[PDB]
Amino acid sequence: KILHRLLQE
Amino acid sequence: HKILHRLLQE
Amino acid sequence: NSLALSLTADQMVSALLDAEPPILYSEYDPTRPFSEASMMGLLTNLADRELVHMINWAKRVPGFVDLTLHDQVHLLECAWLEILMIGLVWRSMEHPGKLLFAPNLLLDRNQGKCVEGMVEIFDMLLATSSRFRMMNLQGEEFVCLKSIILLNSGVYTFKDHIHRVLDKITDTLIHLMAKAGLTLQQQHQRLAQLLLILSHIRHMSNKGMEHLYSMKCKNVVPLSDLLLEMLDAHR
Amino acid sequence: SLALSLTADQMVSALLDAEPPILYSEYDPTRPFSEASMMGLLTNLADRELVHMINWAKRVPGFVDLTLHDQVHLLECAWLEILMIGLVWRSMEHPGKLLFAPNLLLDRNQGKCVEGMVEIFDMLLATSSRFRMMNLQGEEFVCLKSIILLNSGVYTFSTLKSLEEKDHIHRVLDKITDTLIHLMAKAGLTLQQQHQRLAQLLLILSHIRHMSNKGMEHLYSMKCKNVVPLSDLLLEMLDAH
Ligand SMILES: OC1(O)[C@]2(Cl)[C@@]3(Cl)[C@]4(Cl)C(Cl)(Cl)[C@@]5(Cl)[C@](Cl)([C@]1(Cl)[C@]53Cl)[C@]24Cl
Ligand SMILES: OC1(O)[C@]2(Cl)[C@@]3(Cl)[C@]4(Cl)C(Cl)(Cl)[C@@]5(Cl)[C@](Cl)([C@]1(Cl)[C@]53Cl)[C@]24Cl
């Protein structure tokens, strides 16, 4: 999930 | 024409 | 000039409490509804009958009958489903995990599954009921909230008069919280919490409107012309 | 928790410092825009703004205290509301027009290029008109935006663990209410005026919720009409609804 990724970095 | 028009006036 | 602006807070509350519509019963099918058609039949039948009482309730909300007929039509078209849903949630409050559609029709989310796309709205309704329960929502606060919905939900789809009546209802809500002994910090905090739930009620109504439209297109049950016209106004 | 100890002025300061930037579109006045290409421009812009929104959310007091699953859910629920209220805020000084970008200022008539966009444009314009009517302040606006992020998803969340989560968001929300009142008191409003304005401000959030759901339906329409290109992140955000 793109949003999942973006929140993590 | 709407039923709402008529019920609001009753 | 409108009589609504000259009432007191207590007169406002009493006028709102007196205008409350009755709680209606469902058809007495002694069968736990387990089909989509019988489910949708019972609920839209109930909704049709409640709408007639809502229209006559709305005429008793101070400031409402001072608007033009076209504005009254517009406000009710925009708000009718929010108002039915907040009433459902209110009636269901003292029945955790269940939705009291009528005293002889109390359902749980297991039965929301009998209808396609219904368990999701069912869970939103149940969460709202629990939120009201934990906040110890009072009947005087509930009737203020319901009238705010009526006057607010369509007011930006156009004003001065409605916004003054809206301010008057805010004053009434505060008045009710002060009477209950709440501190100033608690008063504006609770006012905020209450009004923020109206955002969630708006969301549930939009999802409910979509579901009702799909069931219209599914032709699962015949809908009354009144209910159809209330639906069509949301395009 | 750092969020819960913040003072009213520090909350305002933290929210003002976290404000994302205003981005430019690829609009070219000389280039002819179809119904689609104008929509490609706006969806291109929204996709870039979503990246800044995600990183803005991390700076909202209390947001990072939540599980990453909760963070994902709040943004999935709130993202369109947040884009729209920012659009309304940017357009407040341009009556009858929407300032999608400093170089892209559209009016209602041009919003008739994309089938279905006229109705949503009118609602956004009606909201901007209301913001102007109330003389909305920038400090009030950043409060409203954080409320949307925290509030819009807090009732569609399991265990008693996921319930302590919901309980923390409420304390942060109450802190933002305190901040709003603090601002109005400083501006010299009576208590009755502070409560009336607080109510007026939060009632707008219902109209923003309404516009968001109407907008989500328009974006899903665009999607499987498959004429306007749509980014992978927008498509995932769309699927969340
Ligand atoms: O409470 C309602 O008014 C509401 Cl809001 C729901 Cl929850 C939907 Cl969305 C469905 Cl179509 Cl599930 C149905 Cl049958 C309708 Cl007609 C009633 Cl009676 C329910 Cl139960 C509608 Cl519009
Ligand atoms: O401001 C938006 O984010 C919003 Cl809210 C609208 Cl108004 C809709 Cl409803 C459409 Cl589909 Cl018309 C489009 Cl292109 C999207 Cl992606 C943007 Cl950029 C606009 Cl302009 C969406 Cl979802």
Residues facing C102 on adjacent strands: C105
Task: Report DSSP state, residue C116.
Answer: T
Q: Which among D211, D19, D222, D27 has a CA at the least distance from the CA of D105?
A: D27
- Two tokens at C69? 């007929």
What is the domain range of residue C142?
1-235
CA–CA gap between residue C159 and residue D228 (Å, rounded): 37
Q: Determination technique for this PDB entry?
A: X-ray
**CA of D216 relative to ligand 1 center, distance in Å:** 21
Q: Which residues contact C65 (CB under 8 A, 6 or more apart)?
A: C59, C72
In this structure, what is the dihedral angle of CA atoms C113, C131, D63, D43, given to the nearest 10 degrees?
50
| Nearest CA among C153, C131, C98, C136 for reference residue D156 | C131
d(CA D181, CA D100): 30
Tell whether D240 lies on the interface with C, counting CB pairs under 8 A.
no
Task: Please check whether residue C199 touches D, CB under 8 A.
Answer: yes
* Breaks in chain D (C–N > 2.5 Å) following residue: 157
Chains D and A touch (3+ CB pairs under 8 A): yes
Q: Which residues in chain A are contacts of D237 at CB distance < 8 A?
A: 3
CA of C112 to the centre of ligand 1 (A): 10
Name residue, tokens 């209410």.
Answer: D177
Q: At what angle do helices D161-186 and D191-225 cross, to 10 degrees?
A: 120
Give how far Cα D59 sits from Cα of D20, D52, D146, D225, Å. 10, 11, 10, 37
Is C79 in contact with D210 (CB distance < 8 Å)?
A: no
Give me the CATH number covering residue D157: 1.10.565.10
Using DSSP's 3-state secondary structure scheme, residue C98 falls into: strand
Assign 3-class secondary structure to chain D: CHHHHCCHHHHHHHHHHCCCCCCCCCCCCCCCCCHHHHHHHHHHHHHHHHHHHHHHHCCCCCHHHCCHHHHHHHHHHHHHHHHHHHHHHHCCCCCCEEEEECCEEEECCHHHCCCCHHHHHHHHHHHHHHHHHHCCCHHHHHHHHHHHHHHCCCCCCCCCHHHHHHHHHHHHHHHHHHHHHHHHHHCCCCHHHHHHHHHHHHHHHHHHHHHHHHHHHHHHHHHHHCCCCCCHHHHHHHHCC
Q: What is the resolution of the experimental data for this entry, in Å?
A: 2.0
Alpha-carbon torsion (C91, C95, C99, C101), positive or negative: negative
C-alpha closest to that of D174 among C217, C194, C60: C194
**Could you tell me if B6 lies within 8 Å of chain C, comparing CB atoms?**
no
Q: Considering only the C-alpha atoms of chain B, give the largest distance between any 2 of them, rounded to a whole number of Å.
A: 14
Domains held by chain D: number = 1
- Return d(Cα C57, Cα C62) in angstroms, integer: 10
**What is the distance between the alpha carbons of residues D83 and C142, in angstroms, rounded to a whole number?**
31
What residues contact D51, with CB distance under 8 A and at least 6 apart?
Answer: A6, D233
Beta strands in chain C (DSSP E): 98-102, 105-108
**For chain B, the helix, strand and coil percentages under 3-state DSSP, each to the nearest 5:** 70, 0, 30
Residue with tokens 């009702």: C212
**Sign, Cα dihedral of C220, C222, C227, C230:** positive
Amino acid sitting at position D99: L
**What CA–CA distance (Å, rounded) separates D199 from D77?**
23
Report the C-alpha gap between C208 and C81 in whole angstroms: 8
Q: Which residue pairs from D38-41 have beta carbons closer than 8 angstroms and sit at least 24 positions apart in sequence?
A: D38/D110, D38/D113, D38/D114, D39/D113, D39/D114, D39/D117, D39/D222, D39/D227, D39/D228, D40/D228, D40/D229, D41/D104
Listed by the residue before each break, gaps in chain C with C–N over 2.5 Å are 158
Residue D37, both tokens:
């290409």
Is some CB atom of chain D closer than 8 A to the CB atom of C207?
yes
C-alpha to C-alpha distance for D122 and C156, rounded to whole angstroms: 10
Distance CA D92, CA D209 (A): 19
Residue of D118, D164, D180, D195 for testing the chain C interface, max C β-carbons within 10 Å = D195
Give the count of Cβ contacts less than 8 A between chain B and C. 25
Helix (H, G, I), strand (E, B) or coil at C102: strand
User: Distance from D64 to chain A by nearest Cα, in Å?
Assistant: 9
Locate tokens 């009947």: which residue? C139
Count of residues in chain D: 241
In contact, C39 and C220? CB cutoff 8 Å? no
Ligand lying closest to the C-alpha of residue C122: 1
DSSP assignment, residue C107? Answer: E
What is the DSSP secondary structure assignment for residue C155, as one 8-state letter? G
Residue C132 backbone phi and psi in degrees, to 5: -55, -45
Residue identifier of the C-alpha nearest atom 6 of ligand 1: C208
Report the C-alpha gap between C106 and C128 in whole angstroms: 16
Contact present, C106 and C98 (Cβ < 8 Å): yes
**Ligand nearest to the CA of residue D35, numbered in listed order:** 2
For D24, the token pair is 């430019």
> C40: how many CB neighbours lie within 10 A of its CB?
22
Q: Please indicate whether chains D and B are in contact, defined as at least 3 beta carbon pairs under 8 Å.
A: no
CA angle centred on C101, ends C100 and C103, rounded to 5°: 65
Chain D residues within an 8 Å CB radius of C173: 199
Ligand 2, CB cutoff 6 Å, lining residues: D 39, 42-43, 45-46, 80, 83-84, 87, 114, 117, 120, 215, 218-219, 222
Number of other CB atoms surrounding residue C33 within 10 Å: 19
Other Cβ atoms less than 10 A from the Cβ of D241: the count is 15
Distance of alpha carbon D93 from alpha carbon D171, whole angstroms: 34
Residue C12, ligand 1, Cβ within 6 A: no
Best of A1, A4, A7 to disrupt the D interface by mutation (most D CBs within 10 Å)? A7
* Spatial contact of C43 and C85, defined as CB atoms under 8 Å apart: no
Neighbours of chain B (3+ CB pairs under 8 A): C
For residue D156, the chain C residue with the least C-alpha distance is: C124
DSSP 3-state assignment of C101?
strand
* CA C132/CA C47 separation, integer angstroms: 22
Closest to D38 (Cα-Cα) out of D220, D234, D228, D235: D228
